[model samples]
Target: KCTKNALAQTGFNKDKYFNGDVWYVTDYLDLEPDDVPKRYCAALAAGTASGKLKEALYCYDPKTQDTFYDVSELQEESPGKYTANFKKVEKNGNVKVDVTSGNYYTFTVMYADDSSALIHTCLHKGNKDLGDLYAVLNRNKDTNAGDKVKGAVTAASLKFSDFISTKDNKCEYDNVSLKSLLTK
Candidate 1:
């Protein structure tokens, strides 16, 4: 599981930095690498007024079939959180063995920051694998962004992927995509 320290190294506060919304992303499959099926996943969290973590949104990309699934109640860690699993039943215009390993993948808990930013954990599977992916995740400014908060806060980018992977798991995936607009 990804941890808090991993994120701190990125220069963002674990407790008060990411207090709003967040997103995730995974790499696109190459298809030529031994026919191994690869998948991408991500999670996001928002802080409540009481300063507790709250469930926000989660998603995973099953590139093999060009489908993506979202898990809305992802914050329930106990009593078994709602699982969003997908299967690759066919390839090359033919059916193959059902892929069950995808079900075991789970994202770690995420926290919110004071800046109204979102933070979460993620995992990737395939030729690039989780270990190699973590390296990219651990790197600074790999995949993240932020918005302006009133005054002085200006807009800041939160490197969330770096925080989670740096703690326990070495596995990594692609960075989350972000969008923004200027208002005057």
Candidate 2:
């Protein structure tokens, strides 16, 4: 499950910042046009501002192909409370697995590739991913040489990609291809 709208659970207003600046967050996790069949898991909490998760794991028994496992991190005091660090499927038997070692401090996934961004910040932080920055680029600079250099940027061909930011604001398009991002 994506932590897209859980910011509200953090006690912060989702529509605006404390300073009254409008902000929004979303899942920029568009899998490639041709991606492998898989499921993903992640844990994100902005410290006390957000919520947390208990330690857990997602295990699969390939031979059976029907049974999967969900185990929580075991706590030891007197010891021997739990037999294994993680439940072993069998005695040295091989099986498909995506183990977090009963840990959920970060995130987990099954058959997952590079991690996708959940974009937990102001909309401006996602400017590169947002279209408004580019969609507003095309407009009449001046009307009748007196209307001023400004107008609604309503052209579709004028891509924000044509515009570049460097020396200080380089955009890191973490995902490989657009098809790789939206198709899934």
Candidate 3:
């Protein structure tokens, strides 16, 4: 059901994480872009405007019908990365997540960045990671940001193509989740 991405959109590869001092936000509360279904584009903005899984962005699937990003048993392998999803006890309790039967989830490997900015990237085409790498809220900065990297991205500075569009032209999705989020 998930096609994991080998490299993150940030241009940083995980196998060489030791190359720099990195930090991930999963510990506090963690949280798409391309590779999404045809329906997700609509579902995401609607959920976001109405604020559905905004509280828990990383794991929730906007078009999952009965969408849910509930909970997961994450094991902190070191620092910026976590995986081997499980609820088992560890030597230092370094990995602790109140995982239940229905709430159990996986960490579809996302990228690692050095900044506090919630860096989003395009997940693999298989949709395994479900991470929102880019979004065009209203098409502001550069007027064309939308998560998943399009064209060629180099070690160049982040222009409008690096993140969401700043405009506020609210979008609409015909999904049940979107309708419900609006009511809430």
Candidate 4:
């Protein structure tokens, strides 16, 4: 979905939106050939409708159908450094939509300095449970709906991972390790 519509559907006022600040650096100040950092921020923005997320940054290796790297949710350990300020105007109004229920939807944000760019990745489930939660929010006729949506999205995302693993060869990531790549 387009950012403008996504925000509007969730009850965000366009007038109140703020374009975020991001710094991209391509070359690190100090680096040996062997010590070169593998990660850096590629894109940054702080508005209700930033264009960064909609674009694809990393290349997907067709041989493996795996994306090399992607944006991730900001970790609690270092929230401030990679945070996207998406204030839930109504508590849990933000929703991610996916049409292919069998595919996993991974969300990410990329930012960079002169030396390198880094992609942070977060995984989400593609299912009706999430879609329903989003629908509830879109209706916007109930209070505390945001909380329910947030909880549902969180639970569904995790559950969907397990759900996929249980199915025989239904959905798999053979060559990619989400944990290792995000950290190293």
Top candidate, metric lDDT: 1
Per-residue lDDT of candidate 2, residues 7-93 (tens digit): 111232322211111111111232121155432211111111122211222222233343332322333222111111332222122
Candidate 1, TM-score vs. the true structure? Answer: 0.28
**Candidate 3 lDDT, 23-141, residue by residue in tens:** 22211111232354322322121112232221122122234433222212234443333332223222222234343343322332233322222223222222244443322222122
Better of 2 and 3 by lDDT: 3
Error of 3 at 119 (Å): 3.9
For each of the candidates, the C-alpha root-mean-square deviation to the true structure, in angstroms, is 12.9, 19.6, 13.1, 19.3
TM-score of each: 0.28, 0.18, 0.28, 0.19
Give the Cα-based TM-score of candidate 4 against the true structure.
0.19
What are the per-residue Cα lDDT tens digits for candidate 4 across 1-184? 2121111113322222122222222212111122532222222222322333211122223334443333232322231122222211111222232223343332222222222222223223433112211111121111222344334434433231221111122222322222222222
lDDT agreement of model 2 with the native: 0.21
Candidates' lDDT values, in order? 0.29, 0.21, 0.28, 0.24
Q: Is candidate 2 or candidate 3 better by TM-score?
A: 3
Error of 4 at 96 (Å): 16
Off by over 4 Å in 4: 1-53, 62-111, 127-184
Give the CA lDDT, 0 to 100, for residue 118 in model 3.
28
> Comparing candidate 2 with candidate 4, which one achieves the higher TM-score?
4
TM-score of 2: 0.18
